[PDB]
Design a protein around this ligand. Structure first.
Ligand SMILES: [Cl-]
Ligand SMILES: [Cl-]
Ligand SMILES: [Cl-]
Ligand SMILES: [Mg+2]
Ligand SMILES: [Mg+2]
Ligand SMILES: [Mg+2]
Ligand SMILES: [Mg+2]
Lengths: 381, 378, 379, 376
C-alpha cells in the first residue's frame, strides 16, 4: 500500500496588498494602534506531498511573517520523518511529529504551523487514495453547505461601512462582523448604524482585537448589547484567562475565541473556566487533526464552533470546509470576500461561497488543488 | 455511493438459594445482581444495496428481545438508506431520537452500539481498510493483554491458575475482591510472592463499598504493589470515587458500565479516575473513540473492558484500541475468548500476553457459517 | 399475608416538510430531531395477589413499548411474584439492583420499574383500605393547583387567545414552548403578559436545544415581562451549562421531566443548578418520585410535576404522591390528553377551576374502565 | 377514620457529689448527669380507643419537655389522623420554627409525639411500623457493644471477651475511659479479640481537629472501625478537616435533631457514618436522615441510650425499613434491667437485635411500668 515518497515546501506570494507606518526594509509594517506586524503582500506556505504510486497531496499554513522559518522546520526536521509513512495514519503521524520536540516546549507557534501544512496534505492524500472527500474519513458528512458570515467591513467611515454591509446583504448574506478598532465613532454607534441599516433579522458580531482589560471589555460589550450583539470575539489578551472568564461571566453575550490557538490543549483551560461559548479554530494554524480535536471537545462541552478564515490560497480553507462538514457543532464559518474572490484563479475544484453559504467541495481529498497557474507562481524553499 | 438496505437482529446463545428460575435467571446473594445460566449476546447484520455485509454485536445477557425491539421497531428505519461512511454522524442522529426523554444509556445505547459497530465494519469493507485506518491511523498491531480474573475457590488454587497463565506469556492480572475469602491483603501478599516483583496485579472491587471502606481495602493492598483499583464504589457515588482517588496513591479505574463520553465528563472533572475502562459491547466504536479521545486530552490511561461475546464487539474493541494513543493494555477473558475461535473467521488472536489486531478490511472478523446457523432471528 | 401472584403487561393505543410517518408510525420533527408516534400509546401493568386484589401501573409506551414490556415479562416479573406489596419501596430497590452494575439505571429499565412500582403501591393502598398518600406520610391536600402546559396555536395572538380562554375557566398559571414562539420569546411574553394581566404566572419551556449563553440571552429577553420559570434551558448532560445559567439569571430554573431516579438529581443540586424539580411519574414510579420530592424538601427546591400523554393511571399516582409531598406548588395539566381519556377511568380524579381533584378511594383511587380493559393489548 | 382524642405525658425513673436536685457535673467533660435514669413518655388515645406510646429524653428538666407537649403541642395534635403522622410532624415543627425552636427540647417533644402516632398508625392498619415505611428489609439487626465500663485496661479487654463469647463481634470504647492512651487500648483489645472483630472509638467531642487527627492516627495501626464525635458539634470546619486528614470513617449524629442538621455536614463531606438517636428525633426525622444517607452513600449506625425501650423499639422498626443500616448500638446495662418494663418480643442476643413482630411498635409498657409512671 502507498507510502509517502517526497515532501516539498514553497511560498505563494500574491499581488494583493495589506502615516509613519511605512514598510521596513524587509516589507513589514507595524500598526501603531495595535503594535502588531503585517507583511505588505499576501503570502502563505504550501507543502506538496507525493507518494510512491504518484498520488499528490497539498497542504497549506500561514506564511505572513518569516515564512522560511516554517519551511525550514518542514524541510530540516519533519519531512525526513514523514517519508515512508502511510497517509491513512495521518493523525498518528501528527502525534509522532508533535512528540519530536514537545519536551523542549515547541508545542505551538511556527512548529504547529509546519505540522498543519503536513497534516492537511496527508489527509488530502488519504481521501484521494480512498476516493472520498476528507469529511467521509472524519466520521461523515453532516452538511454540504455551511452558512458564512462577512468577516469585516473595511471602509473609511461608519456610513460607508454600513452600505458595504447592505451590499453583501443583497447577495444573500445575513451575518456580519466588524472590528472594534475601525469603529471611529465608537462601538455603540457602529452597532446602531448597522442594526438600523440592516434591520432586526441579521446577526452582528464584534471582534474586539484582544487589547482590553476585563473591565474595559465588559463596558464595551454592555454598550453594544442593546443593539442585538451576536457575539464578542477576543475581548481580552490570550494570556488573560482570569480576565476572559470574568468577561464571559459578566455579560449575556456569547464570548468567542480561538483563532490564535494551535492545539486542543489550548482549549482545555478556557473550557475549564467556562470562559467561552464559541470556539473559532483557524485551520491554517492547526491542521485537520487538531481542528477536529477542538471541534470534538466543543461537542462534549456544548460549545459552538465558528471557524476563522484568513489570507490564503484556498488550500487550508478547503480543509476547514471539509472538517467543518464533519463537525456536529459547526454553525457558521467566517468568509473573507476580498481574499476568496481574487484567489479563485489559484484553484481547481468546486469550492464556492455565494448567497450567504459555502459550498463544500465534492471531489476526493480536499476537493481542491492549486491550478497550473498557481503551481507556476510557487517559489520553492 | 452505496447505502444501507436492510438490518437484521439476532441472539446467539453459548453454554458456559440461587437456582435459575423459570427463565434461567439467578441472583447472587453476594451482590444482588442477576445472571443468566447461559451466556447470550445480540448480533446485527447490515447489508447495503450492492450487497456488502457488516456485523455488529452488543450485550444480550438479560431481556435481549428488548434490545432487538429497539433496533427493529425504531432504529432500523432511520438507518436504512444512510451511507456507512457517515457512521458517527448516523450515531448522533439516532441518539438524538430519544435523548429529550432520557433514553440516553442502558438498553438504548446497547442498541446503538450494535448498529454503530456494523456500520463501521461496512465503512472499512467498502474502503478495503481495517477500521483503525478510518479512525486516524493504526498505532499498534499488538495490544498487551491482562488476565481478567482467577476463578478458583482457594487463595492457593487461584495463585496457581495465575502462574500458569504467566507461563503462557501473560504478565498482568486482575482478581475480584469478593472472591478473596481470606481478605485482599492475603490475596495480594500471596500472588506477589508467587509471581514475582515483575507482574502487574490489579483488583476489581465490584462497586459495593463506601469511600472509607474502599480506602481501607486499597491501603491494605498497596504494600504489595497494586497496579490499579477498579470500581471501588457505587457508580452513582461520584463524591465517593473522588475521595477515594484523592486518598490513595493507587490509580483508580472505572468505566465498564458507562455508555457515552457524557458519562465520563463528571468523573474527569472531579479528578476521580486515572484509568477509564470502556466496554465496546456497551458503547460502539463512535462512543468508544470519543471516550478515548477525551482520555487523551485529560491524560487518562485507557484499559478497555472485555466480556462474554461472539468476538464481534471484541474485534471492534481491538480495532478502536489500535487507533487510540492512550491504550496501554486490554482485558482478556480467557474463559470466553477461548471456545469462541470456532465462531469467527479472521485472524484475531491472543497469545503470549498480547492480542493480535485482526488484519482484514472492516473489523477483520465475521461469524463463520456455523455461527450464522446458530443465530436466532428476532 | 397476601403476596403477589401474577403480572401482565399491555399496551393501550389512542387516536389523536418531509416528516411523513414511516411504516411503523414514527415521524421525526426536523426542528428538534426527536421521534414521535402518530398515536398516543402507553404501557400498563396489571398485578394480582394470591387473594385476588388487583393493582394497576402505567408508564411510557410511545416508542418500542414491547421493549419495556419485555423487561417486565422476561426479568422483573419473576422477581416480584411472591413479595408483599407493603414492601413496595424495598422491592423497587431490589429490582433496581439486579442490573445496576451493568449500567441499566435509567431509560426503559426504570420505566419498567415505574409501572411495577405504581401497581404495587396501588395494591398496598387497596389492601389497607387507604389512599396511597396515607401510606406516604399523610395527606396534606386534596386539591392541587394546575397550570396550562402548552399553547398549541400557530400565532402569538391565537396562542394568547388560547391562554385567555383557560384563564376564563379559572387557570392563572401558564407555560409556552420557546420553539413555537415564531416572533421570539420576548414578543411572546409581551402579548401573553398584556392579554392576561399582571397577576398570572407565565413560564417558558425552552426545550433543551441551547448553549448556556444562548439560554441566558433568551431568558434575559423574557425577564422584563415577569418570567415564572425557565425550563430545560440546555442539554440534559450539560450540567456545567445548567449551573451557569442558574447562576447568571435571576429566574427560577426548572428541570427533571426526563430523569429517572433521585440519583439524577443529586449532581444538579450539588451545582445549585435548579430552583424547581419537575418529576414525571410515568418515568419514575412513586418510590423514586417521593425520594426526589423529599430531596427537594431538604434542599428548598419547589416540586412541579410534569404531566404527559397517558391513560390516567400514572397521573393518578402523580396526584397521590403530590398530595403527600410538603413542597408541591402546582402540577402540569394537559387538557388535550386529559379530557379525552376521561372515558378510560373509573374514579373521581378531576381537574377544573384551575385545580386537580385528588382521587378519594383506596390505592390510587382509579382504575381502567371496562372499555379501557377491552382495548388492552397483552404483551 | 379514627382521630387523636387525648394525649398525656409522664416521667419514668430508674436506678462531683450530686446537688440537692440529683445532678452532678463531671470535671472530665463538663457535662451534667442525673443520678437516676429517667425518660419522658407520651400516651396517645384515639376517639375509638386505640392507644399509641412514644418516648424521648427525660434526663434533665423533663418537666420542660412535658410542658411543651402539654401546653402547646397536644391541642394542635388532638383531632388529626395518625396516618398523617409525618405531615403532623411538619405542622408542629412549623409552629415555632421562625422563632428558632428547631432542636433541643422542642424536637425532643415532637419526637415523643411522632413515635406515638406511628405506633397508632401501625396498630390501626394492623402493620408493624416498618411496613408503613416502605417495607421490611430485615428482621434482625447486627448490634455492637456500646462501651466497656471497667476501671482497668485489662478488665475492659475481658468484659469485651465475655461479650465476644456471647456472639458479639463489634465493639466501641470511649476515649476518656482509656487511662493508658487510646493507642494502648486499641492494641490490647486487638490482641485479646483477634483480627476479625470491629473496634471503634467514641472520642467524646472535646478535641481540636489536630488533636483528633493525632489520636486517630495513633489508633489506625491497630484496625480502627470508626472514630465518633472527634471535635465539637459546632466545629464543622474541624470535622471536615478530620475526615479529610485520616483514612478512618468518621461517625456523628447522636446529638442532632433533624435532617437539616445533617445537610451542612454532608455538604462538607465531613462524615462517613450517621448515628441518629431515635429518642431525640422521632420516626419522621430518623427516616429522613436515613434516606438522606442513602442518597449520599453514607452508613447508618443508630445510637442507643438510657430508656424504657419505647424509642428503642421505634429505632428498630425504623432500621428494619432503612436501606443503609449496618448495625445498631447496644446498651447492655440499660437494655437488660429494663426488660421488665416492656411487653413484646423485642430482644438482643448472639450479637443481634430481634425487631418486634406485632403491629405498630410491637411493644408497649408493661403493667409494672404503667404503675410507676408519674404524670405531668
Ligand atoms: Cl514558534
Ligand atoms: Cl434502559
Ligand atoms: Cl431547647
Ligand atoms: Mg479575530
Ligand atoms: Mg470490573
Ligand atoms: Mg418540558
Ligand atoms: Mg457517642
Amino acid at each position: 500500500s502507498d507510502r509517502v515518497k517526497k515532501i516539498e515546501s514553497f511560498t505563494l506570494t500574491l499581488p494583493r496588498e495589506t502615516p509613519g507606518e511605512e514598510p521596513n526594509g524587509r516589507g513589514y509594517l507595524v500598526r501603531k494602534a495595535n503594535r502588531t506586524v503585517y507583511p505588505t503582500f499576501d503570502r502563505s506556505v504550501l507543502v506538496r506531498i507525493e507518494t510512491e504510486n504518484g498520488a499528490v497531496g497539498w497542504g497549506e499554513t500561514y506564511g505572513l511573517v518569516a515564512p522560511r522559518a516554517t519551511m525550514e522546520i518542514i524541510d530540516d526536521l519533519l519531512a525526513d520523518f514523514t517519508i515512508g509513512r502511510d497517509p491513512f495514519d495521518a493523525a498518528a503521524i501528527h502525534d509522532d511529529l508533535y512528540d519530536l520536540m514537545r519536551v523542549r516546549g515547541y508545542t505551538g507557534g511556527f512548529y504547529v504551523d509546519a505540522l498543519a501544512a503536513i497534516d492537511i496534505a496527508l489527509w488530502d492524500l488519504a481521501g484521494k487514495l480512498a476516493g472520498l472527500p476528507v469529511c467521509k474519513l472524519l466520521g461523515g458528512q453532516r452538511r454540504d453547505r455551511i452558512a458564512a458570515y462577512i468577516s469585516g467591513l473595511p471602509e473609511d467611515t461608519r456610513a460607508k461601512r454600513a452600505e458595504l454591509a447592505a451590499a453583501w446583504q443583497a447577495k444573500g448574506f445575513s451575518s456580519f462582523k466588524f472590528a472594534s478598532p475601525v469603529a471611529d465613532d465608537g462601538v455603540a454607534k457602529e452597532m446602531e448604524i448597522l442594526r438600523e441599516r440592516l434591520g432586526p433579522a441579521v446577526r452582528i458580531a464584534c471582534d474586539m482585537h484582544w487589547a482590553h482589560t476585563a473591565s474595559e471589555a465588559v463596558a464595551l460589550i454592555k454598550a453594544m448589547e442593546p443593539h442585538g450583539l451576536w457575539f464578542a470575539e477576543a475581548p481580552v489578551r490570550t494570556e488573560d484567562i482570569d480576565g476572559l472568564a470574568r468577561v464571559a461571566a459578566s455579560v449575556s453575550t456569547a464570548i468567542a475565541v480561538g483563532e490564535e490557538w494551535r492545539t486542543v490543549h489550548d482549549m482545555v483551560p478556557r473550557v475549564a473556566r467556562r470562559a467561552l461559548a464559541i470556539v473559532q479554530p483557524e485551520m491554517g494554524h492547526k491542521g485537520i487533526t487538531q481542528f477536529m480535536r477542538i471541534g470534538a471537545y466543543a461537542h462534549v462541552h456544548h460549545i459552538k464552533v465558528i471557524p476563522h478564515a484568513t489570507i490564503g490560497a484556498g488550500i487550508f480553507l478547503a480543509a476547514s470546509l471539509q472538517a467543518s462538514a464533519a463537525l456536529a457543532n459547526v454553525d457558521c464559518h467566517e468568509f473573507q470576500h476580498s481574499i476568496f474572490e481574487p484567489n479563485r484563479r489559484l484553484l481547481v475544484g468546486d469550492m464556492d461561497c455565494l448567497n450567504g453559504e459555502y459550498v463544500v467541495p465534492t471531489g476526493p481529498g480536499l476537493g481542491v488543488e492549486p491550478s497550473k497557474e498557481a503551481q507556476g507562481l510557487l517559489k520553492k524553499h
